[PDB]
């Protein structure tokens, strides 16, 4: 029944590694939180406010795609109402945009040179990763080379 499908939802957010009996007890915390709400503007405007939150942060066509995909979703209705509640609950270029040396009937706007400055950030982001790597390899070894002996070995601790 439906009580088995709540436990299937309990199985999905558990990654595989007791450990089938922790599941039936987490199933209770799932039921204790299901009845907290039960104890105590259409759908499409809620799409427009998040499309707005995108468009203020730049990146215009990405809002233009999210509205097109919810348009064929409006052509099952209860699940997008769940999707608007979960936002950030998970884990915390092509040469046809800013180039006029190619195209077929390419238009003219002259230079912009305010996305050329975000084309230097396009390199700064690559540099911020390959400096984070050299930050993540000298730390993972200084945490083991500095201690008293017997902290990286569980067998010395017995």
């Amino acid at each position: 029944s439906i009580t088995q499908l709540f436990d299937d939802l309990c199985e999905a957010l558990l990654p595989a590694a007791n450990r089938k009996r922790a599941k039936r007890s987490l199933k209770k915390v799932a039921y204790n939180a299901l009845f907290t709400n039960l104890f105590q503007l259409p759908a499409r405007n809620k799409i427009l406010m998040l499309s707005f939150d995108l468009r203020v942060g730049g990146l215009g066509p990405k809002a233009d795609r999210l509205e097109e995909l919810v348009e064929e979703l409006e052509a099952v209705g209860s699940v997008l109402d769940l999707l608007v509640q979960l936002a950030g609950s998970g884990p915390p270029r092509d040469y046809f945009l800013n180039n006029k040396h190619v195209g077929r009937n390419v238009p003219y706007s002259g230079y912009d040179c305010d996305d050329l400055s975000v084309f230097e950030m396009d390199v700064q982001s690559l540099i911020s990763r390959e400096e984070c790597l050299c930050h993540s390899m000298i730390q993972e070894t200084l945490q083991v080379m500095e201690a008293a002996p017997g902290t990286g070995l569980p067998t010395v601790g017995l």
Binding site: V144, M145, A147, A148, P149, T151, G152, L153, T155, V156
Partner: peptide, 13 residues
């Protein structure tokens, strides 16, 4: 691998 980890900490000491 555990052996070489222990040998490395003793050298610092």
């Amino acid at each position: 691998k555990e052996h070489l980890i222990l040998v490395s900490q003793l050298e610092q000491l």
